[PDB]
Amino acid sequence: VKKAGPVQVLIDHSFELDETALNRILLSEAVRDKEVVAVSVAGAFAKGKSFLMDFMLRYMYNQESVDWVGDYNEPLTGFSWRTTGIQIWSEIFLINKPDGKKVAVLLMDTQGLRDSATVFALSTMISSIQVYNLSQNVQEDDLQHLQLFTEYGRLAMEETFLKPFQSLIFLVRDWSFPYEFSYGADGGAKFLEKRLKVSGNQHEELQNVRKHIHSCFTNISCFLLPHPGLKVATNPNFDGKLKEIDDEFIKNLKILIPWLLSPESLDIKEINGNKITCRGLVEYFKAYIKIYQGEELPHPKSMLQATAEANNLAAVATAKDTYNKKMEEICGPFLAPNDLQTKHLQLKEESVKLFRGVKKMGGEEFSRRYLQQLESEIDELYIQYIKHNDSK
Ligand SMILES: Nc1nc2c(ncn2[C@@H]2O[C@H](COP(=O)(O)OP(=O)(O)O)[C@@H](O)[C@H]2O)c(=O)[nH]1
Ligand SMILES: [Mg+2]
């Protein structure tokens, strides 16, 4: 049987990408060319990330049901919730957006000390929606963890107003101050604004993330969640059934999840102004994995170079597939040899023009290398189209 499930894509303290598993999930014909919403939940271990993500799964499987949260005797399944890495759900959901788009929705469960910092940075660079899962309060160490993204963001915006990151959500579990800061998004926004306010008393490097974080991220928001009740907290025989979950937690959970994942809420991954497809997103995985196998985290310039690389190679992948799709429409009857070449040269130049037309990072000399990679991979496709045409 075929069934969707969680797939380990990221695993000495070295980190390995499972390319075949990634390609199998994101390069399938149904989703490869769809623009992608990459949803991540990240943060410290044992704070309820997988639990949350399993309720997200219930919503993505029945977005239009008023009762998506589930039967109250229905056990909670999906990502295991009771080792360091990133799991993705093998069903890449195709959701109608109100504008007529079908977008692909990828869910990543990001489990993590330098190892957890690496997993947190990797998931944030890949994501378009990052749910920063925190327990009870937001503390200065929590803010500190974002400093490298701000410094990356400063270099990235030296010459454009386009922000490198999309949505970051501070999700504070087991919230402790529900009088002044109500459960939900509005109290969250009220708290986050106060917490993010610049104060002379904070260490200089933490004033820096406060000063700069909003300029790096398209949307910063904060949602305060109540404690889920004693059974969800303590019991070993607890299997996730809603009837054993505090009812104020359920009510706010039902607001949170469409707030993050409803069709109007799905933020498409975009870099340097261009929306990213599932095919393209694989290139960001492969480029970022290269710089996350050193002693410490990469420097901002190293992260910017990886974005530029992925940005160019996603352009190669698009142009190549465009040539490849149209070529197969011709080559599958039999085409006369010089006819096949005219059409090949016409089609290869079109994909060259497409590649050139993309706003790519790094500059002309940087991208000329990837132009020539594209042409070489097109020539390779063409040589094999002649040997299948000559068998006709
Ligand atoms: N205190 C508390 N525990 C929770 C909450 N949500 C889930 N849990 C419990 O936390 C335990 C481990 O959760 P898990 O999803 O594996 O956390 P993860 O490691 O961050 O993915 C389970 O017993 C859950 O029932 C919450 O909001 N507060
Ligand atoms: Mg987890």
79-97 burial by CB neighbour count: b if 16+ within 10 A, else e? bebeeebbbbbbbbbebee
> Residue 53 Cα, ligand 1 centroid: separation in angstroms?
11
Chain centre distance of CA 90: 14
Q: Using CA positions, which residue lies closest to atom 8 of ligand 1?
A: 48
* Most ligand 1 atoms within 8 A of CB, residue of 40, 51, 55, 80 to mutate: 51
- Indicate the length of the chain as a whole number: 392
* Most ligand 1 atoms within 8 A of CB, residue of 53, 232, 257 to mutate: 232
Closest CA to 94 of 49, 3, 29: 29
> Residue 311 Cα, ligand 2 centroid: separation in angstroms?
29
Q: How many whole angstroms separate alpha carbon 82 and alpha carbon 295? A: 32
Helices (H), the chain: 19-26, 49-61, 114-126, 140-144, 147-156, 185-196, 204-216, 230-234, 247-261, 278-291, 300-331, 337-357, 364-389
Q: Find the ligand nearest to 228 CA.
A: 1
Cβ neighbours of residue 351 closer than 8 Å, sequence gap 6 or more: 319, 320, 322, 323, 374, 378
**C-beta neighbour count of 314 within 10 angstroms:** 24
Q: Find the ligand nearest to 175 CA.
A: 1
Q: Using CA positions, which residue lies closest to atom 19 of ligand 1?
A: 46
Q: What is the dihedral of CA 54, 60, 66, 72, to 10 degrees?
A: -20
> Residue 91 Cα, ligand 1 centroid: separation in angstroms?
23
276 close to 36: Cβ distance less than 8 angstroms: yes
> Residue 257 Cα, ligand 2 centroid: separation in angstroms?
17
276-307 burial by CB neighbour count: b if 16+ within 10 A, else e? bbbbbbbbbbbbbbebbeeeebbebeebbbbb
Amino acid at 365: E
Nearest atom of ligand 1 to the alpha carbon of 51: 15
Q: Find the ligand nearest to 110 CA.
A: 2
Local structure of residue 99 (DSSP, 8 states): T
134 close to 52: Cβ distance less than 8 angstroms: no
Q: Which two tokens stand for residue 81?
A: 């919730």
Ligand 1 is surrounded, with C-beta below 6 A, by 45-51, 81-82, 173-174, 227-228, 232-233
Local structure of residue 17 (DSSP, 8 states): B
36 close to 103: Cβ distance less than 8 angstroms: yes
Q: For the residues of 148-185, what is the DSSP string, one character each? A: HHHHHHHHHTSS-S--SEEEEEEEEES-S-TTTS-SBH
Give 168's strand partners: 130, 220
> Residue 47 Cα, ligand 1 centroid: separation in angstroms?
5
> Residue 374 Cα, ligand 1 centroid: separation in angstroms?
46
Q: How many whole angstroms separate alpha carbon 38 and alpha carbon 63? A: 17
Q: For the residues of 183-203, what is the DSSP string, one character each? A: SBHHHHHHHHHHHHS--TTS-
Cβ neighbours of residue 44 closer than 8 Å, sequence gap 6 or more: 112, 116, 133, 134, 135
389 close to 334: Cβ distance less than 8 angstroms: yes
**C-beta neighbour count of 253 within 10 angstroms:** 20
270 close to 118: Cβ distance less than 8 angstroms: no
Q: Which two tokens stand for residue 385?
A: 């189209």
Local structure of residue 31 (DSSP, 8 states): T
> Residue 105 Cα, ligand 2 centroid: separation in angstroms?
18
Closest CA to 186 of 221, 213, 135, 226: 221
92 close to 23: Cβ distance less than 8 angstroms: no
Identify the three-state secondary structure at position 137. Answer: coil
166 close to 128: Cβ distance less than 8 angstroms: yes
**Through-space distance between the first and last CA atoms of the chain, rounded to whole angstroms:** 38
* Most ligand 1 atoms within 8 A of CB, residue of 41, 76, 81 to mutate: 81
Chain centre distance of CA 26: 12
Cβ neighbours of residue 29 closer than 8 Å, sequence gap 6 or more: none
Q: How many whole angstroms separate alpha carbon 284 and alpha carbon 164? A: 13
Q: Using CA positions, which residue lies closest to atom 1 of ligand 1?
A: 233
* Residue 43 φ/ψ, nearest 5 degrees: 140, -175
Q: Using CA positions, which residue lies closest to atom 5 of ligand 1?
A: 48
Q: Which two tokens stand for residue 60?
A: 């993505």
Q: Find the ligand nearest to 108 CA.
A: 2
Nearest atom of ligand 1 to the alpha carbon of 80: 16
Cα torsion 123, 125, 127, 133: sign: positive
Closest CA to 103 of 234, 222, 228, 277: 277
> Residue 8 Cα, ligand 1 centroid: separation in angstroms?
20
**C-beta neighbour count of 203 within 10 angstroms:** 9
Chain centre distance of CA 381: 31
132 close to 43: Cβ distance less than 8 angstroms: yes
Give 108's strand partners: 40, 88
* Residue 359 φ/ψ, nearest 5 degrees: -70, 100
**C-beta neighbour count of 204 within 10 angstroms:** 6
Q: Find the ligand nearest to 49 CA.
A: 1
Q: Using CA positions, which residue lies closest to atom 14 of ligand 1?
A: 48
> Residue 380 Cα, ligand 1 centroid: separation in angstroms?
51
Instruction: State the resolution, in angstroms.
Output: 2.0
> Residue 228 Cα, ligand 2 centroid: separation in angstroms?
17
